[PDB]
Design a protein around this ligand. Structure first.
Ligand SMILES: CCCCCCCCCCCCCCCCCC(=O)OC[C@H](COP(=O)([O-])OCC(O)COP(=O)([O-])OC[C@@H](COC(=O)CCCCCCCCCCCCCCCCC)OC(=O)CCCCCCCCCCCCCCCCC)OC(=O)CCCCCCCCCCCCCCCCC
Ligand SMILES: CCCCCCCCCCCCCCCCCC(=O)OC[C@H](COP(=O)([O-])OCC(O)COP(=O)([O-])OC[C@@H](COC(=O)CCCCCCCCCCCCCCCCC)OC(=O)CCCCCCCCCCCCCCCCC)OC(=O)CCCCCCCCCCCCCCCCC
Ligand SMILES: CCCCC/C=C/C/C=C/C/C=C\C/C=C\CCCC(=O)O[C@H](COC(=O)CCCCCCCCCCCCCCCCC)COP(=O)(O)O[C@@H]1[C@H](O)[C@H](O)[C@@H](O)[C@H](O)[C@H]1O
Ligand SMILES: COC1=C(OC)C(=O)C(C/C=C(\C)CC/C=C(\C)CC/C=C(\C)CC/C=C(/C)CC/C=C(\C)CC/C=C(\C)CC/C=C(\C)CC/C=C(/C)CCC=C(C)C)=C(C)C1=O
Ligand SMILES: CCCCCCCCCCCCCCCCCC(=O)OC[C@H](COP(=O)(O)OCCN)OC(=O)CCCCCCCCCCCCCCCCC
Ligand SMILES: CCCCCCCCCCCCCCCCCC(=O)OC[C@H](COP(=O)(O)OCCN)OC(=O)CCCCCCCCCCCCCCCCC
Ligand SMILES: CCCCCCCCCCCCCCCCCC(=O)OC[C@H](COP(=O)(O)OCCN)OC(=O)CCCCCCCCCCCCCCCCC
Ligand SMILES: CCCCCCCCCCCCCCCCCC(=O)OC[C@H](COP(=O)(O)OCCN)OC(=O)CCCCCCCCCCCCCCCCC
Ligand SMILES: CCCCCCCCCCCC(=O)OC[C@H](COP(=O)(O)OCC[N+](C)(C)C)OC(=O)CCCCCCCCCCC
Ligand code: SF4
Lengths: 86, 140, 340, 86, 183, 171, 127, 60, 167, 76
C-alpha cells in the first residue's frame, strides 16, 4: 500500500514549513505586543500609525483611549525634513 | 561523504554494460546505495571500464579519464577489461585497461554477476574507509 | 534587532533544508513509481542523503577549462543561486507573515523570475564552444518563451484583485479559490511552470543536446552545487506562486467554530496554533504540487524544440488571447469590477 | 491631458497658482497681459523656489556670523524611534 | 544615522564608474554585462528617490527583455572588436576633454532662467536646503502610482495608448518582414 | 501629499500657539477608537465638518489661518461625541475597538460586537449609523445576513457577549 | 533595519562562503589533458563561425514586442475599477490591435522551421 | 470609505493648527535672527496675499 | 447627480450659417437622421471599389492579358467600399448636426424628440453608466472627432450631458 | 490529408473543418469572440432583469453647494 519511506521526506518538508510558519507568527505577535500584523498598509494607514505612536507615548500600538489628549501631545508634532535629492 | 554519494561515469560499452543496467534494475538497485550515473566525467567520482578496450579507443578512454576531478578511482568490470579476456590474442585489443588507466578494484567475471559488480562496489567503498586524507597530512 | 535576525535565521534554515530534502524525496518517489526503493543506506531511513551529496560535492575540485572565462564560469552559479533564493521573501506563511511585506509583491516576484534567465545564457559563453553555445541558445529561447505566458497568467489573476500585494490576494481568496472558476488556467499554469524550470517533460538540454549533461556539463564542485540548489529552489518557488495565486495560500477551511470550542482568549498558544494551521495548509498545497512535478517527470518522453515552440506560440498563446478577452468581459457583463 | 494630475490622481503641488494664472489669462486679451505678470511669477517660484532659496541664503549668511547664534525657541531633532518618547 | 545620508551621491559616483567600464572592455559581452549593472544602479536610484514601482519595471523590462535580447544577439553572431589601445584614441582625447567640459556645463545650464550666464550655472549647485514634508489628510484610498498611470493612459491619453498599439504592432511586423525570405 | 524618501530627518519645534488664538482640546483617541466612533462623530458633527470644509473652500489658499475659528468647533464636537460614548457604553465600545485591533482594522471582521455597539448607542446616545449615497433596494452591508466575507477568527469576548445578549433578549 | 534587507545581504554571504569552502578545502592539481572542453571523449576543431536558422533569432527578437504589451496591460489591471465601462473598451481595442498583428505572425508561419526531407514528390515519367 | 471621510475634517483641523503654530514660530525665529540689519522677515516671496506654509529649511 | 456637466460650455455656437444641433451627436442619432441621399453615398462607395479595380485592370492589366480580378479581391473591395461609404455617410450626417450644411429637415426632428423626452420624464441626453468625471473625460475625447476622419475612425457612444446647448 | 476549402466557398462547412482539424485556432477565436459580443448583447438584459447598477463610490470629501449658514454651539 502506501509507502512510509517515500512520504517520510515529505513529512519532513511539511514539518519544517509548519514549524517555520508557527515560530514566525509567534515572533510577529511578540513584536507587536500580543496582537496581529497589519498585512496591507495604506498611506492613510501609515500616517495614522505614526499619529498613534505620537498619541500613546513611545509604544508601538498601545492603542490608548482617552477623552482629552495630554499636554506634551500638542508639542511633540514632527515635520519630516527631506534632503536635496540631487 | 565520499561513500554515501558515489557517482560513476557510464563508460560501459559492450556485454558488461547491460549487466551494469541490471545494477540499475529494480531487483538489484543502485539508487538505494547512493549510486547514480552522472554521464559526464567532469562530475563522476569514478569510472567503470565495463567492456573491451580496443586499440582505437585507448586514447579516448584516457581522455575520458583525464578529465575527472582529482579524488578519482576506477573499477575494472569484466574479464575483457582486465587482461584482454576472451580476445586476448587479437590484433585490435588492449590487454586490459591496466595499460591505460590506473585501476583500483578488479571485478572478475565475463558477465560479472550483478551480485559481483555490487560486491566490487562495496570493496571500493571499503577502500574509501581507509583513505585517510586528513590523517595523512599529519604524516602518520 | 534581535527579533528580526532570529526570524530570518529560522526562515533561511527552514527553506534551505526543505530544498535539500526535496531531492531526496524525488529519488524516493521516482523509485517507487518504478517499483524500487529509494536511498536507504545513508541515514536510518535514507534521510540526510542530500547532505552526503553536498559534503562530497564541496570536496571535489573545480576545473576551469582553457577556452573559458574563469570569472563568468564562477559568477553565473552565484547569480543563479541568489536569484533563485531572493524570491523567497515575498511568500506569506500566513496573513502578513513575509520576510518583507511590500505593497507590490507580485511585481517583485515577477521581476526576479525575469532575472533567472541570465545564468543559463551567460553560462553558455563561459567555455565558448559552438556545440555549447547553440544549446544555450535553445535553452534561453525556451525559457523566455514560457516566461511570457507565466507573466500573462499572473495578470489574468490580478484582474480579480486589482492589488499587487499578495496577502491581499489570499485574503480575497477566502470566499472562493481561483483554481475552481479558472480550471484550464491551472492546467496551463502547471505546464508553463514545468517549462520555466526546464523539467524533463519539457527538457531538451540535459538529455538531447550535443552536451551530455546540459549547458552545465563541464563543471565540478561549487559551480554544480549552486546550480543544483537553484533548480530545486526554482521548483518550490514556482510551486509557491501557484500556491498563492491559484490555489489557496494559507487557507484550508473556516475554523472559527473549532476555536470558539477550544480557546477562551488571545494568547501565545492561540497564535502558535493558528500559525501551525495556516502554514500546514500552505505546506500541503506546496507538497502536493512538488509531488505533481515528480509525478509528471516519471511518465513521459520529451520534446523537440520545434514541438516546443509550436506548443507555446501557436497553441497556448492564441488560447491565452481568448482568455484575455473573455475574463474582463465576464467581469464587465455583471456589475463587478474589483476595487483597490 | 494630465495637466494637473498628481501622483495619487489629485491636484499637484502648484495647481492653485497655475489655476490662478489661468483665471488671469482667461479674462484678458493680448496687449494687456502685462498685468498678468505677478501670477506667473508666483507660479514659477512655486515650481522652482528661486526667491525662497535666495531669501534663505541671505538669512543663512547672517546666521554663521553671530557668536551668540540662536536666542529663540529652538527646533529639536529626534531619532526615528523616538517620535512620542517623553 | 547619518551613514544613510550620502547614498544618492554614492550611486551617482557608482553610475559614473560603471560607464567607464562599458566603453572600455576587451570582450563585448563583458561590457554588456556592465550595462546590466548600470540598469541595477539606476533601479537603486529610483527606489532611493521614492519610486519603488519603477525600479521593478526597469528590472523587468530593460534587464529582462532588452539585455536578454542583446546577449542573445552577441552569442550566435560575429563581431570583431579592437582593444582600447592608447595609440588609436590618444588622438581623440583633446576633443573628448573639450566636449566633456562643454556638454556637461551646458547640460547643467538649462534648469535656470537668469539672463546672465554665470548665474545660470550656480543655481544648479544651490540645492542644500532641505524640503519640508507635511502630512495632509485629504486622500482616502490607496491610489498608488501605477493606479494613476492606469487612469491617465486609459482616459485622458487613451489615443496615446492606441497609437502605441500601432507602434507595438510595427515592432512585430518589421523584424518578421525583414527576416522572412517568403518562399 | 508626497511621501518622504531618501534620508528624511524628523524634527519638532518647542513653541506655542499665539495669544489671539484661544486654546482648544485635542482628540486623544487612537485609530481603532477613532475608526469605531467615526460614524457617530460623522452623524453628530455633519454641519460643523461641512462648515469647516466649506469655509476652507471659499477662502482659497487662505486655508490655514482664516478658517481656524471653525476647525475649533469640529474638534470640540467630536470630543463631545467620544466623551458621551465613553460614559454611555465604555465596555461595548471597548469590545468593538479591541476587536478592530486585530484583523488589520478591517470593519469586515467585527460584525457581532458592532451590532452590540450600534444598539447601545442608538438606545442611549440616540445616534444612528448610516451609509449615505445608498439608493433604496440596496441593502447596507453591515445589516446583511450570511455575508460572503467572514473573518478568519471570531474573537471570543464578542461571541460570548453576543450570545449573552441573545439570551437576555435585549437583541 | 527591516528583515527584508538582511536577506538580500545574507544570501550572498552564504554563497560566497560555500564557494570559499570549496576553494579552500578541495585540491587544485590541474594539467593540460584535464583542461579542454568536453565533447564525448573526443577533441575536435571548433569552427570559427557557424550558420543558424532565422527562427532561432526570430523567437527572441519577436519576444520583446509581446513582453512590452504584457507590461502595458499592467497599468490597467490596477485601475480597473476607476475606468468603469470606458477604459474597458480602450483596453479591448488595444488588445484587438495586438491580436491582428499576432494573426499576421501565425499566418506567415514565422517561427516554424521547415524540413528539407522531401519524399520525392515527382513521379516517374519515362522517355 | 465613508468612515474615512467622516474622520477627515477632525484630523485636518489638527494638522491645520500645527501648520499655523509652527509656521508663526519659524517666522518669529527668523525675525529674532535678523534683528539689527534691516530685512523684512514678515514679507512673503509670493505676490499673492494668501498665506503659505514655509519649506526648504536650513539643515539641522 | 449624473446630470450636472460641472463645466463651462459654448452655447449655441454655430459653426456655419445654420444653427447647430449637437456638439457631438451620439452614434445612434446620426444613424437615425441620415437622408436617402446618404444611403445613396454608401451604395456608391460599395459599388465604386470593385468596379474601380476592374476598371484599373482594364486600363493596364497585371499579367499582360486582360482577365477579371478574382472574387477574393471583389469581396474585400466590397467590404472596404462599405467602409468608405459609412465613413463618408457618418461625416456628412454629422455636418448637419454642426450647422455647417442644410439641416432644416433634421432640426424639426430634434424639436420633436427633445419635446418628447420632456413629456416622458427622463434625462435630456440619456442616463449613462459612468461617473460624471468619466462622462466629461470621455466626451473631451469624442468632441469634434469628425475632423481627422482621414487618420482614424472615432465615434461617440457615451451619453454625456453637454452638447453645446442651453437648458 | 485534409485540404483547406476556404471560408468563402462554404461558410459553415469551413467552420466545421476548422473545428475538426484546427481546434486550437477555432476555439481560441471562439473564446475570444464570446467576450465582446456578449458584452454588447447581454448587459442591457442584465440591467433590465437581474439587478440594476450600483451607486458610485465617493472619491474625495463631498462638498455641497451652499453658502455657510450660521451654526450655534461650542463657542468657548
Ligand atoms: C464604430 C463603428 C462600429 C460600431 C460597432 C457597433 C456598435 C453599436 O452599434 O452599438 C452601439 C451601442 C449603443 O448603446 P445604446 O443601447 O444605443 O445606448 C447606451 C449607450 O451607448 C451607453 O453609453 P454609456 O455612457 O452608458 O456607457 C459608456 C460607453 C463606453 O463605451 C465607450 O465609451 C467607447 C469608447 C471607445 C470608442 C471607440 C470608438 C472607435 C475606436 C476605433 C479604434 C480607434 C483606432 C485609432 C488608432 C489610433 O458604453 C458602454 O459602456 C459600452 C461598452 C461595451 C464594451 C463592449 C464593446 C465591444 C467592442 C468590440 C465590438 C465588437 C463588435 C462585434 C463584432 C463586429 O454602443 C456600444 O455598444 C458601444 C460599442 C463600442 C464599440 C467601439 C469599438 C468599435 C471599433 C470599430 C472601429 C472601426 C469602424 C470602421 C468604420 C469606418 C468608418 C470610417
Ligand atoms: C473578436 C471581436 C470582433 C472584432 C474583430 C472582428 C474579427 C471577427 C472576424 C471573423 C473571422 C471569422 C472567420 O471565419 O475567419 C476565418 C479566416 C480563415 O480564412 P481562410 O479562407 O482560411 O484564409 C486562407 C485563404 O487562403 C485566404 O482566403 P482569402 O484571401 O479570400 O481571405 C479570407 C479572409 C477571411 O476573413 C474573413 O472573411 C472574415 C471577414 C469578417 C469581417 C467582415 C466584416 C464586414 C463588415 C462590413 C460588411 C460590408 C459588406 C456589406 C455588403 C453591403 C450591405 C448593404 O481574409 C481576409 O480577407 C480578411 C478580411 C480583410 C478585412 C476587410 C474588412 C474591411 C473592413 C470592414 C469594416 C466595415 C466597417 C463598417 C462600418 C461599421 C458600421 C456599424 O481566418 C481569419 O480570417 C483570421 C482572423 C482575422 C479575421 C479578420
Ligand atoms: C565536520 C562536521 C560538519 C561538516 C563539514 C564539512 C565537511 C568537512 C570534512 C573535510 C575534511 C577535510 C577534507 C579536505 C582534505 O582532506 O584535503 C586535503 C587537506 O588536508 C588537510 O589538511 C585537512 C585540513 C582541513 C581543515 C579542516 C576544515 C574543516 C571543515 C570546515 C568546513 C588536501 O591537502 P592539500 O594541501 O594538498 O590541498 C590544497 C588545498 O586544498 C587548496 O586550497 C590548494 O589550492 C591546493 O593547492 C591543494 O594543494
Ligand atoms: C534517471 O536517473 C536520474 C535520477 O534518478 C535516479 C536523478 O535523481 C537525477 C538528479 C540527480 C540528483 C537528484 C543527485 C544530486 C543531489 C544533490 C547534489 C543534493 C545536494 C544537497 C544540498 C545542496 C544541501 C543543501 C543544504 C544546506 C546548504 C544546509 C542548510 C544549512 C538525474 C540527473 C538522473 O539522471
Ligand atoms: C535598491 C535595489 C533595487 C530596488 C528594489 C526595490 C524593491 C522595493 O520595491 O522595495 C520596497 C520596500 C518598501 O516598499 P513598500 O511597499 O512601500 O513597503 C510597505 C511596508 N508596509 O523596500 C524595503 O522594504 C527595503 C528596501 C530594500 C532596498 C534598499 C536598498 C537601498 C540601495 C542603496 C544603494 C547604495 C549603493
Ligand atoms: C466550449 C468552450 C471551449 C472548450 C475548450 C476549452 C478551452 C480551454 C482549455 C484549455 C486547456 C489547455 C491545456 C493545454 C492544451 C494543450 C493542447 C495539446 O494537447 O497539445 C497538442 C499538441 C499537438 O498539436 P497538433 O499539431 O495540433 O497535433 C495534431 C496531430 N496531427 O501536442 C503537444 O504539444 C504535446 C502535449 C503537451 C502537453 C503538456 C503535458 C505536460 C504536463 C501535463 C500536465 C498534467 C497535469 C497533472 C497535474 C496533477 C493532476 C492531478
Ligand atoms: C567567494 C570567496 C572569494 C574566493 C576568491 C579566492 C580566489 C582565489 C583563487 C586564486 O588564487 O586565483 C585563481 C586564478 C585561476 O586562474 P589562472 O590560474 O590564472 O588560469 C587558469 C586557466 N585554466 O588565478 C588568477 O589569475 C587570479 C584571479 C583572481 C584574482 C585574485 C587573486 C587571489 C590572490 C590570492 C592571495
Ligand atoms: C479572438 C482572438 C483570440 C484568438 C486569436 C488567434 C486567432 C487565429 C486566427 C488564425 O490564425 O487563422 C488562421 C487559420 C488558417 O489555417 P491554416 O490553413 O492552417 O494556415 C496557417 C498558416 N499557414 O484559420 C483557421 O483555420 C482557423 C480560424 C477559424 C475561424 C472560424 C471561427 C468561427 C467562430 C465561431 C465561434 C462561435 C462562438 C460563439 C459566439 C457567437 C458569435 C456569433
Ligand atoms: C530531522 C532531520 C534529520 C534526521 C536524519 C537522521 C539520520 C541519522 O542521524 O543517521 C545517523 C548518522 C549516520 O548513520 P549511518 O551509519 O550512515 O547509517 C547506517 C544505517 N544504514 C546502514 C541503514 C544506512 O549518524 C550520525 O552520527 C549523524 C550525526 C549528525 C546528524 C546530522 C543531522 C542534520 C540535520
Ligand atoms: S567482459 Fe565478457 S560480457 Fe563483457 S564485453 Fe567482454 S566478453 Fe562481453
Amino acid at each position: 500500500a502506501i509507502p512510509f519511506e517515500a512520504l517520510l521526506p515529505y513529512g519532513i518538508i511539511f514539518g519544517l514549513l509548519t514549524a517555520g510558519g508557527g515560530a514566525m507568527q509567534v515572533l510577529h505577535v511578540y513584536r507587536n505586543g500580543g496582537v496581529r500584523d497589519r498585512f496591507a498598509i495604506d498611506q492613510w494607514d501609515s500616517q495614522m500609525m505614526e499619529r498613534d505612536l505620537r498619541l500613546n507615548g513611545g509604544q508601538g500600538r498601545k492603542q490608548v483611549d482617552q477623552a482629552t489628549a495630554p499636554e506634551a501631545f500638542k508639542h511633540n508634532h514632527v515635520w519630516k525634513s527631506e534632503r536635496p535629492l540631487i | 561523504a565520499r561513500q554515501g554519494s558515489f557517482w560513476p561515469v557510464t563508460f560501459g560499452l559492450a556485454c558488461c554494460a547491460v549487466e551494469m543496467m541490471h545494477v540499475s534494475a529494480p531487483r538489484y538497485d543502485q539508487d538505494r546505495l547512493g549510486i547514480i550515473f552522472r554521464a559526464s566525467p567532469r562530475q563522476s567520482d569514478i569510472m567503470i571500464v565495463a567492456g573491451t578496450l580496443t586499440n582505437k579507443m585507448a586514447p579516448v578512454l584516457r581522455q575520458v579519464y583525464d578529465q575527472m576531478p582529482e579524488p578519482r578511482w576506477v573499477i575494472s568490470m569484466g574479464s575483457c577489461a582486465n587482461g584482454g579476456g576472451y580476445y586476448h590474442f587479437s590484433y585490435s585489443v588492449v590487454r586490459g585497461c591496466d595499460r591505460i588507466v590506473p585501476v583500483d578494484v578488479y571485478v572478475p567475471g565475463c558477465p560479472p554477476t550483478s551480485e559481483a559488480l555490487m560486491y566490487g562496489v562495496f570493496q571500493l567503498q571499503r577502500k574509501m574507509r581507509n583513505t585517510k586524507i586528513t590523517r595523512m597530512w599529519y604524516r602518520k | 534587532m534581535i527579533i528580526n535576525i532570529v526570524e530570518i535565521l529560522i526562515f533561511l534554515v527552514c527553506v534551505l533544508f526543505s530544498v535539500a530534502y526535496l531531492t531526496v524525496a524525488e529519488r524516493k518517489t521516482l523509485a517507487y513509481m518504478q517499483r524500487r526503493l529509494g536511498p536507504n543506506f545513508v541515514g536510518y531511513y535514507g534521510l540526510l542523503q542530500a547532505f552526503a551529496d553536498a559534503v562530497k560535492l564541496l570536496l571535489k575540485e573545480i576545473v576551469l577549462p582553457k577556452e573559458s572565462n574563469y570569472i563568468i564560469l564562477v559568477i553565473s552559479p552565484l547569480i543563479t543561486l541568489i536569484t533563485a533564493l531572493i524570491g523567497w521573501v515575498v511568500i506569506p506563511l500566513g496573513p502578513g507573515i513575509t520576510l518583507g511585506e511590500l505593497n507590490l509583491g507580485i511585481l517583485f516576484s515577477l521581476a526576479i523570475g525575469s532575472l533567472g534567465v541570465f545564468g543559463s545564457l551567460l553560462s553558455g559563453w563561459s567555455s565558448n564552444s559552438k556545440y555549447s553555445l547553440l544549446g544555450s541558445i535553445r535553452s534561453t529561447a525556451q525559457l523566455i518563451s514560457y516566461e511570457l505566458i507565466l507573466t500573462s497568467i499572473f495578470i489574468i489573476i490580478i484582474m480579480f484583485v486589482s492589488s499587487l500585494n499578495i496577502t491581499t490576494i489570499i485574503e480575497t481568496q477566502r470566499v472562493v479559490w481561483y483554481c475552481i472558476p479558472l480550471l484550464p488556467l491551472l492546467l496551463i499554469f502547471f505546464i508553463a511552470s514545468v517549462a520555466e524550470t526546464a523539467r524533463p517533460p519539457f527538457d531538451l538540454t540535459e538529455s538531447e543536446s550535443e552536451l551530455v549533461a546540459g549547458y552545465f556539463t563541464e563543471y565540478s564542485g561549487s559551480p554544480f552545487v549552486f546550480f543544483f540548489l537553484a533548480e530545486y529552489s526554482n521548483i518550490i518557488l514556482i510551486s509557491a506562486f501557484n500556491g498563492y495565486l491559484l490555489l489557496g495560500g494559507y487557507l484550508s477551511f473556516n475554523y472559527s467554530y473549532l476555536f470558539n470550542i477550544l480557546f477562551n482568549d488571545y494568547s501565545y498558544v492561540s497564535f502558535l496554533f493558528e500559525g501551525l494551521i495556516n502554514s500546514s495548509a500552505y505546506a500541503i498545497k506546496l507538497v502536493f504540487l512538488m509531488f505533481s512535478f515528480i509525478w509528471v517527470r516519471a511518465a513521459f518522453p520529451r520534446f523537440t524544440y520545434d514541438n516546443l515552440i509550436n506548443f507555446c506560440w501557436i497553441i497556448l498563446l492564441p488560447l491565452l488571447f481568448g482568455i484575455f478577452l473573455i475574463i474582463p468581459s465576464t467581469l464587465y457583463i455583471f456589475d463587478s469590477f474589483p476595487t483597490l | 491631458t494630465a495637466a494637473g494630475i498628481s501622483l495619487t490622481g489629485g491636484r499637484n503641488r502648484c495647481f492653485s497658482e497655475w489655476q490662478s494664472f489661468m483665471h488671469c489669462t482667461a479674462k484678458t486679451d493680448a496687449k494687456s497681459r502685462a498685468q498678468c505678470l505677478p501670477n506667473f511669477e508666483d507660479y514659477m517660484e512655486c515650481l522652482h523656489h528661486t526667491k525662497e532659496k535666495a531669501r534663505l541664503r541671505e538669512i543663512e549668511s547672517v546666521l554663521k556670523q553671530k557668536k551668540e547664534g540662536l536666542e529663540a525657541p529652538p527646533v529639536k531633532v529626534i531619532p526615528v524611534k523616538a517620535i512620542g518618547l517623553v | 544615522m547619518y551613514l544613510t545620508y550620502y547614498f544618492i551621491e554614492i550611486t551617482i559616483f557608482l553610475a559614473i564608474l560603471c560607464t567607464i567600464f562599458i566603453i572600455s572592455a576587451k570582450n563585448p559581452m563583458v561590457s554588456i554585462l556592465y550595462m546590466i549593472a548600470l540598469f541595477v544602479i539606476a533601479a537603486m536610484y529610483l527606489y532611493l528617490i521614492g519610486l519603488g514601482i519603477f525600479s521593478l519595471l526597469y528590472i523587468m523590462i530593460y534587464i529582462g527583455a532588452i539585455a536578454v535580447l542583446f546577449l542573445f544577439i552577441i552569442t550566435l553572431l560575429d563581431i570583431n572588436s579592437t582593444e582600447l589601445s592608447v595609440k588609436s584614441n590618444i588622438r581623440d582625447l583633446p576633443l573628448v576633454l573639450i566636449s566633456l567640459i562643454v556638454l556637461t556645463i551646458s547640460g547643467l545650464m538649462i534648469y535656470s532662467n537668469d539672463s546672465i550666464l554665470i548665474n545660470k550655472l550656480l543655481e544648479a549647485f544651490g540645492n542644500d536646503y532641505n524640503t519640508i514634508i507635511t502630512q495632509d489628510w485629504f486622500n482616502i484610498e490607496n491610489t498608488t502610482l501605477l493606479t494613476t498611470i492606469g487612469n491617465v493612459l486609459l482616459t485622458n491619453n487613451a489615443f496615446i495608448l492606441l497609437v502605441l498599439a500601432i507602434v507595438l504592432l510595427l515592432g512585430i511586423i518589421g523584424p518578421i518582414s525583414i527576416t522572412m525570405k517568403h518562399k | 501629499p508626497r511621501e518622504a524618501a531618501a534620508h528624511w530627518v524628523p524634527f519638532e519645534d518647542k513653541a506655542n500657539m499665539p495669544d489671539n488664538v484661544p486654546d482648544v482640546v485635542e482628540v486623544g483617541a487612537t485609530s481603532a477608537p477613532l475608526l469605531s466612533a467615526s460614524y457617530f462623530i460623522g452623524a453628530k458633527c455633519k454641519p460643523y465638518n461641512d462648515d469647516f470644509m466649506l469655509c476652507r473652500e471659499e477662502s482659497q489658499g487662505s486655508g490655514a489661518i482664516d478658517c481656524l475659528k471653525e476647525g475649533r468647533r469640529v474638534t470640540r464636537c467630536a470630543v463631545s461625541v467620544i466623551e458621551d460614548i465613553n460614559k454611555s457604553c465604555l465596555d461595548e465600545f471597548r469590545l468593538h475597538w479591541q476587536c478592530l485591533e486585530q484583523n488589520n482594522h478591517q470593519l469586515s471582521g467585527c460584525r457581532k460586537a458592532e451590532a452590540l455597539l450600534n444598539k447601545c448607542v442608538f438606545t442611549k446616545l440616540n445616534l444612528e449609523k448610516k451609509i449615505p449615497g445608498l439608493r433604496p433596494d440596496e441593502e447596507p452591508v453591515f445589516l446583511k445576513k450570511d455575508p460572503w466575507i467572514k473573518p478568519a477568527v471570531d474573537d471570543f469576548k464578542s461571541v460570548r457577549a453576543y450570545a449573552e445578549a441573545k439570551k437576555n433578549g435585549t437583541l | 533595519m527591516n528583515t527584508f534587507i538582511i536577506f538580500i545581504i545574507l544570501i550572498p554571504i552564504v554563497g560566497f562562503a560555500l564557494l570559499a569552502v570549496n576553494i579552500l578545502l578541495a585540491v587544485y592539481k590541474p594539467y593540460n589533458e584535464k583542461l579542454g572542453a568536453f565533447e564525448c571523449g573526443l577533441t575536435s576543431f571548433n569552427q570559427t563561425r557557424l550558420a543558424f536558422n532565422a527562427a532561432f533569432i526570430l523567437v527572441a527578437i519577436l519576444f520583446l514586442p509581446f513582453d512590452l504589451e504584457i507590461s502595458t496591460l499592467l497599468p490597467y489591471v490596477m485601475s480597473i475599477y476607476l475606468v468603469s465601462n470606458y477604459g474597458f473598451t480602450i483596453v479591448l481595442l488595444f488588445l484587438l490591435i495586438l491580436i491582428i498583428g499576432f494573426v499576421y505572425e501565425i499566418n506567415t508561419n514565422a517561427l516554424k522551421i521547415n524540413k528539407h526531407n522531401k519524399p520525392n514528390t515527382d513521379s516517374l515519367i519515362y522517355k | 470609505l465613508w468612515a474615512r471621510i467622516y474622520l477627515m475634517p477632525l484630523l485636518q483641523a489638527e494638522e491645520d493648527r500645527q501648520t499655523v503654530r509652527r509656521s508663526i514660530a519659524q517666522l518669529e525665529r527668523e525675525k529674532e535672527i535678523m534683528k539689527g540689519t534691516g530685512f523684512d522677515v514678515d514679507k512673503s516671496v509670493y505676490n499673492d496675499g494668501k498665506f503659505h506654509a514655509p519649506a526648504l529649511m536650513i539643515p539641522p | 447627480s449624473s446630470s450636472t456637466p460641472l463645466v463651462k460650455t459654448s452655447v449655441n455656437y454655430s459653426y456655419g450659417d445654420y444653427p447647430l444641433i449637437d456638439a457631438d451627436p451620439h452614434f445612434k442619432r446620426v444613424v437615425g437622421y441620415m437622408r436617402p441621399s446618404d444611403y445613396g453615398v454608401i451604395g456608391l462607395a460599395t459599388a465604386a471599389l470593385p468596379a474601380g479595380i476592374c476598371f484599373a485592370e482594364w486600363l493596364d492589366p497585371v499579367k499582360g492579358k486582360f482577365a477579371r480580378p478574382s472574387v477574393k479581391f471583389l469581396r474585400v473591395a466590397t467590404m472596404l467600399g462599405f467602409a468608405v461609404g459609412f465613413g463618408a455617410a457618418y461625416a456628412r450626417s454629422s455636418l448637419r448636426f454642426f450647422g455647417v450644411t442644410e439641416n432644416a429637415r433634421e432640426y424639426k426632428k430634434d424639436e420633436a424628440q427633445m419635446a418628447a423626452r420632456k413629456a416622458a420624464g427622463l434625462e435630456p441626453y440619456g442616463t449613462s453608466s459612468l461617473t460624471p468625471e468619466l462622462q466629461e473625460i470621455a466626451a473631451k475625447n469624442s468632441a469634434h472627432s469628425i475632423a481627422g476622419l482621414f487618420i482614424f475612425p472615432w465615434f461617440n457612444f457615451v451619453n454625456h450631458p453637454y452638447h453645446g446647448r442651453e437648458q | 490529408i485534409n485540404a483547406n476549402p476556404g471560408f468563402w466557398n462554404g461558410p459553415f462547412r469551413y467552420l466545421r473543418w476548422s473545428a475538426h482539424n484546427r481546434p486550437h485556432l477555432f476555439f481560441a477565436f471562439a473564446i475570444g469572440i464570446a467576450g465582446p459580443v456578449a458584452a454588447l448583447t447581454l448587459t442591457p438584459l442584465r440591467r433590465k432583469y437581474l439587478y440594476p447598477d450600483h451607486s458610485p463610490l465617493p472619491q474625495s470629501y463631498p462638498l455641497p453647494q451652499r453658502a455657510r449658514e450660521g451654526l450655534t454651539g461650542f463657542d468657548d
